[PDB]
């Protein structure tokens, strides 16, 4: 199916405690493959997947230089945005950045993106046409005018729909064997009395990849998203994911409830009953 390459950046100011903490991570689909931590001993971009380690020292040289320049740009922007928002130099603040590209199974460019945040809220984002910007408030409009004048969208577009796709295609080929394929979810159900008259029915899905999945509970056709407890999808730590959903039912009426599972490795939507 489709694939993605995404880079995530976080810069957190440390007032009076040194330079800002900077952490950068690269993903292909849901698989991390590179990392950089300003507080780590290497001070280099590091491999985190087997198929990226075959890259030569000139690759790691360029990636280390480019990730450090991103950290130095964020240092400037932390001070600049503190001024835009009229904040003191004493508080800690966060800049987060995400950009990347998606390709189809044929390798064709589908979409590129770039989004920036300040203190966990939207700041500025590139539009899907890769030609215009959307600022979230009047402070971020200052950045937009500066980027519109410098024609930043043109150089960024050349990367997002050009170089980004180029490297993603190469990574998909270099890691074709061990890149996590669509692993179907293993499903089962459990039953947990909470009293003499009620019980918790929990619907499980384990060891699946990718992370996208849908779990729903029906009671005689009708839906019960209100009385359903749904946990966030969670990593198993081996490359696969897990998720469960639970409903409290009256003892004796368990047969009136059905769980429904949807994944990309499922030919048809699985349906379970206790």
């Amino acid at each position: 199916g489709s694939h993605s390459m995404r880079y995530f950046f976080t810069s957190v100011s440390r007032p009076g405690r040194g330079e800002p903490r900077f952490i950068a991570v690269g993903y292909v689909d849901d698989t991390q493959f590179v990392r950089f931590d300003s507080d780590a001993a290497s001070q280099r971009m590091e491999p985190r997947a087997p198929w990226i380690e075959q890259e030569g020292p000139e690759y790691w040289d360029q990636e280390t230089r480019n990730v450090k320049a991103q950290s130095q740009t964020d240092r400037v922007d932390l001070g600049t945005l503190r001024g835009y928002y009229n904040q003191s130099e004493a508080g800690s603040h966060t800049i987060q950045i995400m950009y990347g590209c998606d390709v189809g199974s044929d390798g064709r460019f589908l979409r590129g993106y770039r989004q920036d945040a300040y203190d966990g809220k939207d700041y500025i984002a590139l539009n899907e046409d890769l030609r215009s910007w959307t600022a979230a408030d009047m402070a971020a409009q200052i950045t937009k005018r500066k980027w519109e004048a410098a024609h930043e969208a043109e150089q960024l577009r050349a990367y997002l729909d050009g170089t980004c796709v180029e490297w993603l295609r190469r990574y998909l080929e270099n890691g074709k064997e061990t890149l996590q394929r669509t692993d179907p979810p293993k499903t089962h159900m459990t039953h947990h009395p909470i009293s003499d008259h009620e019980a918790t029915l929990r619907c499980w899905a384990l060891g699946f990849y990718p992370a996208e999945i849908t779990l729903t509970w029906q009671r005689d056709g009708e839906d019960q998203t209100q009385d359903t407890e749904l946990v966030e999808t969670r990593p198993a730590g081996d490359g696969t994911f897990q998720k469960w959903a639970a409903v409290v039912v009256p003892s004796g009426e368990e047969q009136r409830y059905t769980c429904h599972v949807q994944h990309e490795g499922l030919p048809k939507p699985l349906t379970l009953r206790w």
């Binding site: 690269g26 690759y59 990730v67 930043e152 150089q155 960024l156 990367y159 490297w167």
Partner: peptide, 9 residues
């Protein structure tokens, strides 16, 4: 591979 371009905010 990362983007090698930086415009400050």
């Amino acid at each position: 591979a990362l983007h090698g371009g930086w415009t400050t905010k």
